[PDB]
Amino acid sequence: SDSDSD
Amino acid sequence: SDSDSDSD
Amino acid sequence: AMNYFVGNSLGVNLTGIEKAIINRLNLFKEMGRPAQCVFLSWNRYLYRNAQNYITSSDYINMYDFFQEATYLERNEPFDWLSYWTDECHYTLKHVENSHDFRIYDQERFLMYAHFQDPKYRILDYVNHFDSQRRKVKRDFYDVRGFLSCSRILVDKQQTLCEFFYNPEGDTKLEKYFSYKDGKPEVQKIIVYYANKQYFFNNETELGAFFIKQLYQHGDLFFSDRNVYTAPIFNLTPESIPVVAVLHSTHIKNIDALDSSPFKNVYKAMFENLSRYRAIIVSTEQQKLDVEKRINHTIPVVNIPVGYSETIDTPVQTLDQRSVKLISVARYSPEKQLHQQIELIKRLVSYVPKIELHMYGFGSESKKLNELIQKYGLENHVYLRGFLSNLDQEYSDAYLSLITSNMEGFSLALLESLAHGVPVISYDIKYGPNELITSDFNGYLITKNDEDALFDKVKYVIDHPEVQQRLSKGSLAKAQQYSKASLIKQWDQFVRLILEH
Amino acid sequence: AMNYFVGNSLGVNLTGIEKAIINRLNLFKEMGRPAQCVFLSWNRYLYRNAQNYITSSDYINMYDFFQEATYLERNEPFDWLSYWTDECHYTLKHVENSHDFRIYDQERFLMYAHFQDPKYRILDYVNHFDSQRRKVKRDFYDVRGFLSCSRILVDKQQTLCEFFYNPEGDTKLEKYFSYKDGKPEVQKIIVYYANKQYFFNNETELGAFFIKQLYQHGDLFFSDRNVYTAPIFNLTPESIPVVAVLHSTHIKNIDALDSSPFKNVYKAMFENLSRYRAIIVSTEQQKLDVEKRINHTIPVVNIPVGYSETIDTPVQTLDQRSVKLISVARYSPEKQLHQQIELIKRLVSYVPKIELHMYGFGSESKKLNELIQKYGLENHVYLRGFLSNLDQEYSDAYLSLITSNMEGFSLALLESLAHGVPVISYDIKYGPNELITSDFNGYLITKNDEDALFDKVKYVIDHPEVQQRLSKGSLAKAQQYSKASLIKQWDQFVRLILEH
Ligand SMILES: O=c1ccn([C@@H]2O[C@H](COP(=O)(O)OP(=O)(O)O)[C@@H](O)[C@H]2O)c(=O)[nH]1
Ligand SMILES: O=c1ccn([C@@H]2O[C@H](COP(=O)(O)OP(=O)(O)O)[C@@H](O)[C@H]2O)c(=O)[nH]1
Ligand SMILES: CC(=O)N[C@@H]1[C@@H](O)[C@H](O)[C@@H](CO)O[C@H]1O
Ligand SMILES: CC(=O)N[C@@H]1[C@@H](O)[C@H](O)[C@@H](CO)O[C@H]1O
Ligand SMILES: *[C@@H]1O[C@H](CO)[C@@H](O)[C@H](O)[C@H]1NC(C)=O
Ligand SMILES: *[C@@H]1O[C@H](CO)[C@@H](O)[C@H](O)[C@H]1NC(C)=O
Ligand SMILES: *[C@@H]1O[C@H](CO)[C@@H](O)[C@H](O)[C@H]1NC(C)=O
């Protein structure tokens, strides 16, 4: 998922 | 009273 | 080799299942076999609750285990009040009609402290507030003294995550929560153990990890709180032997042996039978009913949960003025205690010097009080609440009544017999008809036949000579459930259970 | 007796203000006076950011101090990839075009790891996920190796609270946050220090507390990032001497000296002047303007934030065929770098070998690149980014441009003159007017007169005999700002600023 990292 | 919220 | 009896926790009032576990522990002690109770659920007063029944070395709690607090005793009380005012220069404002104090730095509110005792010796919890009087953190103290758990709160005091400490203040577990149908549920657990970091999704997987750390080759587990323990044993390797113990009727509707679904509390166990070395039930009839239902997939065996000793307290010192009837049962719907109140209404016009003493606790206590008021029986029926020692109450008891529609055994029935008190019980699954021989130590009567109940209780009141004869039958029957008799069965069981 | 220069932090790329502080420490070091930078904000990269400029002993960071990492050096480098696969038995999936791994165990996504470097020797952060892929926690690693901060998340990855560790993993600070207009704000801080627990409402109150732990009788504070430092010094007793240093224009509209309000960044300072022993500003004119405006309530004194040394790199080795213009300025709107791209668009018509080298960083990076791309100037205008040493870039530079509308002093202007590069600048407050004598070391031109800017730049390109003349003028002007003359002004200041 795109929200997995920062 | 709003003050009773401080406790549980 | 150690034997582990796995329940969930111990409350203030000892329940059936908890008493079955402690009875089993005292039987293994008597025969020289190492045995310990295992408690799963987080309980920071467990050491207080256990104090009155077992010793600190007689049990292991899972949270104590990961918090390095297993076999730890109480510290000498810390004077928090004195440390807050003299050491921290805080100002304490007592809350009237409480053991609570509001804590301030000058005029700034920081903390709300609740003590347990009125002597301020047992800090219970402390709430932490931010600059807007938001409650951001709750500190829960173990009755032993140390801070066990901090809970972080969000929004309207909703639980977001919990941190569990050893007595030194090092973090040992983290739990993370999301709300589903307005209750918090665990979505992640982190455990710091043996210098490593472990990840779990729920308390069951943590349970299964705990069982694995306890286990050494030759150890034996007993699953007594099946609604929690079965799912835990289902995630453990088959190399760890575990016996399932049933404590009550095993199906939702006992009049449909072949068809009725298993109770919710046993579902997970019955759906994975081949995990278990055996099932233990209390009674013959339940052994035969269960072995049929599971088509003999694993051994089913009967070992009663309850045993008698000889009593050093007085036996059958009766008041010659009045009749004392007793009920020893939870104030709970399946005990049908309203029926015994109806019985007294009918008897009071015939034998006005009658007393019914009902020992227990539960939700029905309000309906039962209302029923006594309605019938004007306040002088005759006494809801005595829960007493931790009944020995003195059996001394002057003429008869004990059981109107239950479902038992696994009834520890209260054997306990009554053992004190020489005869019993009149409905003939239900399970236990009464194995513990009472009609006209020997009491009478069995057809389930919910309140007429036959009245007739037979009236017969024993009319015939004090019969009550004396049934009393002596009660002491004789109790001998068939002696300590020695239960040790003989547990010894054979433990010697045959492990694989070879 | 220690001299403390208090700023916020040091970035990956140095700001003007950060450079002024390092310049001042180097002047104190050369004259033999003890000085240390003090940094307030949490920055786990500070140790790395400091490495080109100052020593580990040359600064204290507040979070380092409470985290027991003050003066701690880089650890033995630790192999996370090998720990996770070989010791933990996790499986890593490398993310394409990154220094990142996804981390799985038991067919579950556990963690997302980001490294700083391609050799994966510096773990930066690790995200943790629950059973439903909610990001519940972020672990932030100090570039020295230890885990510095864990942040707990709620909802859409909002910051709820932060835990701050010493390098052993003991908790030393807790911060609780609430959202106000979509940004997280501190509502509570807990610090565990000197065997005690301290409570604060915000970073100002923690700052104040930190300053009071540093201070010994005789020490002297300089307040260099006034938007954070003045509110801190406003909560410390007047017996701690502090000096306010202004780094830029002090009022919002520089045209209304008398009536314009103070900039937001200086309000708390100017609203409590009597707290401060003095104001230091860089320029004569700002000294006259500020002293009139505060009605001489406290002393005001000009010491330039920049100085010149003698240069041990080549100076004015020009390529005869191509001309090189330079801009040393942040990619930020008040620098108005767009005007210089516009100047170049016009100049390529007359000078086909012209290049503009823009050294800096910031927000306008994309908009400036898109402007260069829209004019086909990709071979004439280069955003070179930030270089830590510009020494070799000055060597072949013909002219420096400044198109800024406000400056405290401009270190880039003095650096340019010191390396023999003449400057053409808007005549703006404050700095250029005192650093450039028109027709001696460059040209002052009217604020936002893009017409006059083209004429004077073209004239200097058309006449290399002028550019050389202004290059000798530049080295002469820079001599007035020598290391030696700044030490004299600093030494006199420190001898007189304390009461006797
Ligand atoms: O006032 C009371 C009432 C009950 N009990 C105990 O509670 C247990 C109840 O167990 P039982 O098997 O009779 O029934 P259950 O509660 O499981 O249905 C018995 O051990 C009783 O001795 C007690 O100690 N004090
Ligand atoms: O690639 C670069 C660009 C700029 N700077 C430095 O950043 C500072 C810029 O601050 P200045 O006082 O010129 O103005 P500010 O940017 O603070 O307005 C100066 O020391 C420059 O030499 C640098 O070291 N490398
Ligand atoms: C089903 C029920 O009502 N009560 C049972 C009780 O008969 C039995 O003594 C005990 C066995 O350990 O477990 C209780 O919960
Ligand atoms: C006003 C402005 O934009 N920048 C100033 C700069 O001119 C000055 O040389 C330096 C003083 O240290 O600090 C910056 O803040
Ligand atoms: C996390 O970084 C990854 C890898 O570069 C990128 O794919 C993703 O968009 C990032 N998430 C952000 C910055 O939202
Ligand atoms: C009770 O608490 C409320 C805070 O909501 C406060 O306004 C009031 O002062 C408090 N009273 C006492 C006794 O602290
Ligand atoms: C917290 O307990 C105190 C004292 O018993 C009481 O004043 C307050 O109302 C309690 N708060 C609750 C239970 O809402």
Residue numbers in the entry:
A (entry chain G): 3 to 8
B (entry chain D): 1 to 8
C (entry chain A), D (entry chain C): 0 to 499
Publication excerpt:
Two glycosyltransferases (GTases), SdgB and SdgA, are responsible for the glycosylation of S. aureus SDR proteins such as ClfA and ClfB. SdgB first appends N-acetyl­glucosamine (GlcNAc) moieties onto serine residues (O-glycosylation) within the SDR domain using uridine diphos­phate N-acetylglucosamine (UDP-GlcNAc) as a donor substrate. The subsequent addition of GlcNAc to the glycoproteins is catalyzed by the second enzyme, SdgA, yielding glycosylated SDR proteins in which each SD repeat is decorated with GlcNAc disaccharide moieties.
Despite the biological significance of these two glycosyltransferases involved in pathogenicity and avoidance of the host innate immune response, their structures and the molecular basis of their activity have not been investigated. This study reports the crystal structures of SdgB and SdgA from S. aureus as well as multiple structures of SdgB in complex with its substrates (for example UDP, N-acetylglucosamine or SDR peptides), products (glycosylated SDR peptides) or phosphate ions. Interestingly, SdgB undergoes a conformational change from an open to closed complex upon substrate binding. A long positive tract along the inserted domain stabilizes the binding of the glycosylated SD repeats to SdgB by offsetting the negative charge clustered in the tandem SD repeats. SdgB and SdgA share the way that they recognize monoglycosylated SD repeats as a product and a substrate, respectively, but SdgA is likely to preferentially bind a longer SDR substrate than a shorter one.
